[PDB]
């Protein structure tokens, strides 16, 4: 059946990967003490 | 110490789930035709 014309490729460049992992890891380093309580 | 026993898996999934989301997106960007 005919393909959907609304599809788009998605991208995440390397800097965004590094920024995102820094955000996640620092958020984890911050909130982990409260998770363990 | 008497810590919350779910704190370990809570922290582990907090890191792992969004980190893996980003790694998936990064690697499939690199593999796209250049």
């Amino acid at each position: 059946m005919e393909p959907n014309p609304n599809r788009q490729p998605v991208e995440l460049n390397r800097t965004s990967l590094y920024l995102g992992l820094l955000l996640i890891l620092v958020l984890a380093l911050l909130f982990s003490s409260y998770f363990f309580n | 110490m008497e810590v919350n026993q779910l704190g370990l898996i809570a922290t582990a999934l907090f890191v792992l789930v969004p980190s893996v989301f980003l790694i998936i997106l990064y690697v499939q960007t690199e593999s796209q035709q250049k």
């Binding site: 460049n13 820094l22 | 370990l8 890191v15």
Partner: peptide, 30 residues
Amino acid sequence: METITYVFIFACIIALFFFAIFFREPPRIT
């Protein structure tokens, strides 16, 4: 297990610094 967790996250952050600096996407003048 708590201490291992804190030290693990910290170690991952330091490794991230290493990749972000020495394995950055190089800036290129167009």
